[PDB]
Amino acid sequence: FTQTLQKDANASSEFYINKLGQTQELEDQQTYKLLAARVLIRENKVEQSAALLRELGELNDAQKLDRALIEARISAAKNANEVAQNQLRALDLNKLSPSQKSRYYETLAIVAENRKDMIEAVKARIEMDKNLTDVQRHQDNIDKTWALLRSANTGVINNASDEGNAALGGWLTLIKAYNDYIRQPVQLSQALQSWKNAYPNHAAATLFPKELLTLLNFQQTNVSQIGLLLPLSGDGQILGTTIQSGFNDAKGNSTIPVQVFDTSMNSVQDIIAQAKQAGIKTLVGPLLKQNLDVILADPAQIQGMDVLALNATPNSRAIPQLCYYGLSPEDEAESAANKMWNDGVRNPLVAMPQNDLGQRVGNAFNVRWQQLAGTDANIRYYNLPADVTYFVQENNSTALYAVASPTELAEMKGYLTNIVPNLAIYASSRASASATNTNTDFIAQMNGVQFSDIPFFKDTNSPQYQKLAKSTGGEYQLMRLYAMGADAWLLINQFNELRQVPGYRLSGLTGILSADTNCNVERDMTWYQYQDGAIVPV
Ligand SMILES: [Cl-]
């Protein structure tokens, strides 16, 4: 049974540990412990793997050989590169099975990657590939190899020879094509299609890297007419009208015809049917969450159409040719988690209103905080500003993120500074309004607080700002919606890049725009802090 070690381990570590109770044959026990230890690494559990190796008892030669492989991988994971390399070179490569050789070369690749030697890491993964048999493992190594090449600096790539190594030659041409043409994705598509015919026996010609799949058959954005879905009468009229103005101002003299569909006068399902009958293949909108959910209730309704929805809901998911562009507080909370991390905040307090909005935004913050910190944030819900008094204690260290009005946040800062006067406070754009941000007192009172908002608020002297501030009556909320409409024009004209070019970024009035894997539009916010009675960008 010891021969199992020479084969891929396809089960979970749990599965292998269970087999210990089912078996009382002492030699089989060690084998199962080695199998669990091996998998435990790929589950990113180095210490658990190391602990299990210490539980091993008497081992035959084959079991000792496999333990030494795992030990080398653990050393590589711990960045003990010299030790790991010495450990591998102490093994007899000719005694290893193909599966064991694949593990050997992956460890070598990790060592090289630790050392920032990308070409050497790629060469080790090329050797790993020769020994792999399973398709998913083939694909995973292809994707890791591509990621190594993408991280290499262009100088090393452009000067590297293939060394007579056909696999390396194909890889080098592929990354050069990417680096040379990613800015011209139509030309990159042509180069990638050529690459498949130039290296048809290359491993990646059959299993293309996942990051390149949308580029291989890229299609240029070519908008011919747009249907604009907004609430333009009744309730929500101000919202849609303002978004429409930003949209139309950005559109300027474009000859692209835009047909306007007032969602307050007709159901979205009828509107989409109308647009299809009229031959419209491009929609901007709808805005209201419930109207987006109509689309998501039967996504085939928009088959053949590119759609930039102006909201996102808990039901948003990867749907062909559908992208989601909202100004959600959930996404500002994510920007808050990132900022507080990079600010060096640890153990953050998150004060949310006690309502569904609070849960969603608090949950959004915590999800992101777990990613950056590997632990939970302290989310707490309030009904009144006063409630935050009991969120902190005298002997804390810590920092706060709050979603609340400018007045409510003012009151909060008063209650919290009596318990911890040096508390770093963070807030969302809901805390920034014109009346308060121009008052000498509110600005010295809120001195210290920093908040996220759109970059449009950087230049409060320019003409575009002055004109909009006047036309909106100084209401920051409406200025944000105007900017959203302008950015919607930007996005719909870069729709295929947004969908198909990984990492594509746009400078918008509402922030730096990019798209996640569901084509939800992410926004890199501007942060502002009150300083010397003045508001300065950070
Ligand atoms: Cl709508």
Side-chain angles (χ1 to χ4, degrees):
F1 177 70
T2 310
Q3 202 257 321
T4 298
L5 293 171
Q6 297 184 328
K7 259 57 182 61
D8 289 342
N10 292 323
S12 62
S13 59
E14 289 76 5
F15 173 88
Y16 294 115
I17 294 162
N18 287 327
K19 290 287 184 173
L20 284 166
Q22 303 195 288
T23 303
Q24 44 192 274
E25 289 158 65
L26 197 49
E27 179 184 333
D28 287 10
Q29 288 185 325
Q30 321 310 317
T31 292
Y32 282 117
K33 295 176 177 175
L34 289 163
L35 292 169
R38 182 201 308 189
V39 175
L40 277 165
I41 294 139
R42 59 167 164 89
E43 304 177 352
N44 191 30
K45 303 169 190 176
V46 182
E47 287 306 300
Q48 289 183 232
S49 182
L52 200 43
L53 290 182
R54 294 188 278 266
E55 300 181 32
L56 297 175
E58 192 173 62
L59 302 181
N60 57 40
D61 289 316
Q63 292 167 329
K64 290 173 179 166
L65 182 61
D66 205 273
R67 177 183 193 164
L69 274 182
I70 303 172
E71 294 276 20
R73 176 71 182 258
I74 287 171
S75 302
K78 296 192 297 192
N79 212 250
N81 304 317
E82 322 306 324
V83 167
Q85 274 209 326
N86 295 337
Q87 284 174 317
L88 292 177
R89 293 172 186 180
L91 303 180
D92 187 350
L93 195 55
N94 277 259
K95 296 177 65 174
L96 297 184
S97 72
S99 172
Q100 286 175 325
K101 280 185 176 76
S102 77
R103 291 159 58 203
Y104 178 100
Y105 285 113
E106 182 153 63
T107 297
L108 214 63
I110 291 169
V111 167
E113 183 182 352
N114 290 346
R115 290 170 169 164
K116 316 299 180 183
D117 190 339
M118 294 307 110
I119 298 297
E120 206 61 42
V122 166
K123 287 157 66 173
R125 285 190 181 278
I126 289 167
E127 289 289 338
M128 183 187 184
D129 181 79
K130 294 170 58 171
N131 292 280
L132 296 170
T133 52
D134 173 78
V135 164
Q136 189 55 57
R137 292 185 193 269
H138 272 295
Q139 180 74 59
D140 291 339
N141 184 48
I142 279 160
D143 289 320
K144 285 185 175 104
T145 300
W146 181 243
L148 288 167
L149 291 165
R150 287 273 277 106
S151 78
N153 72 274
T154 55
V156 177
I157 297 301
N158 284 337
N159 296 320
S161 77
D162 62 14
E163 312 179 6
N165 178 334
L168 182 60
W171 277 121
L172 287 172
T173 303
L174 188 65
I175 182 67
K176 288 189 291 198
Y178 183 92
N179 284 336
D180 290 341
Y181 300 108
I182 184 58
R183 170 57 191 163
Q184 304 289 330
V186 178
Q187 296 177 42
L188 176 54
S189 174
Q190 295 170 308
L192 295 175
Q193 296 180 0
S194 296
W195 183 94
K196 292 193 132 190
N197 289 323
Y199 303 97
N201 295 311
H202 195 282
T206 302
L207 304 169
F208 220 45
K210 289 178 180 184
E211 185 186 49
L212 293 176
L213 286 168
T214 61
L215 291 162
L216 176 68
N217 294 118
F218 177 81
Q219 302 142 254
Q220 180 66 291
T221 309
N222 208 329
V223 177
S224 64
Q225 56 183 326
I226 298 167
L228 178 65
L229 279 63
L230 293 172
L232 295 172
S233 57
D235 304 336
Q237 181 179 19
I238 187 68
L239 310 177
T241 303
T242 302
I243 295 170
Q244 182 182 39
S245 296
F247 189 80
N248 285 338
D249 283 352
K251 177 170 75 73
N253 279 327
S254 164
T255 59
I256 296 174
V258 175
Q259 186 170 343
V260 180
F261 296 93
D262 183 351
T263 59
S264 297
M265 296 197 304
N266 199 3
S267 71
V268 288
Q269 63 200 96
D270 288 346
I271 286 165
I272 291 158
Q274 280 185 238
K276 272 195 167 189
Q277 175 176 4
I280 297 177
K281 309 281 190 189
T282 309
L283 307 179
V284 172
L287 180 65
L288 298 174
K289 284 187 176 164
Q290 190 169 331
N291 282 332
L292 174 56
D293 283 338
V294 173
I295 297 175
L296 298 169
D298 181 40
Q301 280 173 101
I302 58 163
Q303 169 60 32
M305 307 172 112
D306 294 321
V307 178
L308 181 70
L310 293 177
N311 214 319
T313 77
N315 296 116
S316 298
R317 58 200 183 267
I319 286 161
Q321 297 182 262
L322 176 62
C323 296
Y324 311 94
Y325 174 44
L327 304 171
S328 74
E330 287 95 319
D331 290 342
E332 276 192 71
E334 295 177 346
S335 178
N338 276 97
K339 180 71 163 59
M340 298 169 74
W341 180 250
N342 300 338
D343 278 22
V345 175
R346 303 295 179 271
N347 178 256
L349 171 63
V350 181
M352 291 288 126
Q354 198 177 44
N355 55 37
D356 292 331
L357 177 67
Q359 297 191 33
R360 297 200 303 276
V361 182
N363 197 254
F365 187 102
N366 194 74
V367 167
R368 180 59 58 85
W369 191 259
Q370 288 169 338
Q371 294 179 355
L372 296 163
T375 183
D376 289 320
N378 171 222
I379 280 67
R380 304 212 58 183
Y381 301 94
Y382 67 92
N383 286 264
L384 290 172
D387 294 335
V388 306
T389 299
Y390 306 89
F391 296 175
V392 289
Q393 297 82 35
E394 317 289 312
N395 63 319
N396 291 146
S397 186
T398 67
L400 173 79
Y401 178 64
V403 167
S405 302
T407 47
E408 292 173 320
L409 189 68
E411 300 172 38
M412 287 189 193
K413 193 207 181 76
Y415 293 127
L416 297 163
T417 46
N418 281 7
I419 316 299
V420 179
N422 295 85
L423 184 72
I425 292 167
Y426 299 78
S428 69
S429 59
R430 195 164 139 197
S432 178
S434 55
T436 61
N437 274 23
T438 48
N439 171 281
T440 310
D441 291 17
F442 178 100
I443 296 164
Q445 183 181 11
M446 295 298 285
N447 186 84
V449 175
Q450 51 181 318
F451 63 90
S452 44
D453 215 334
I454 57 170
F456 190 80
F457 289 103
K458 271 179 179 170
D459 202 347
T460 59
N461 298 305
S462 84
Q464 194 186 24
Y465 183 101
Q466 286 295 324
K467 184 174 174 73
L468 185 67
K470 283 176 167 183
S471 67
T472 62
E475 183 162 13
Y476 286 6
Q477 293 186 280
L478 294 176
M479 297 178 69
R480 293 178 191 117
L481 289 178
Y482 179 99
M484 183 192 193
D487 279 6
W489 172 257
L490 182 71
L491 290 163
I492 195 69
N493 284 283
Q494 304 301 331
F495 194 83
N496 285 349
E497 292 78 16
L498 196 70
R499 288 199 54 87
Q500 299 171 268
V501 178
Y504 192 80
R505 284 173 288 103
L506 288 175
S507 187
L509 299 186
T510 65
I512 306 304
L513 311 173
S514 61
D516 73 10
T517 52
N518 294 338
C519 207
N520 184 65
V521 177
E522 304 295 339
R523 278 198 303 148
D524 205 6
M525 307 292 292
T526 296
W527 283 87
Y528 301 88
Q529 177 170 48
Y530 306 88
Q531 301 183 357
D532 300 337
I535 310 179
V536 306
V538 178

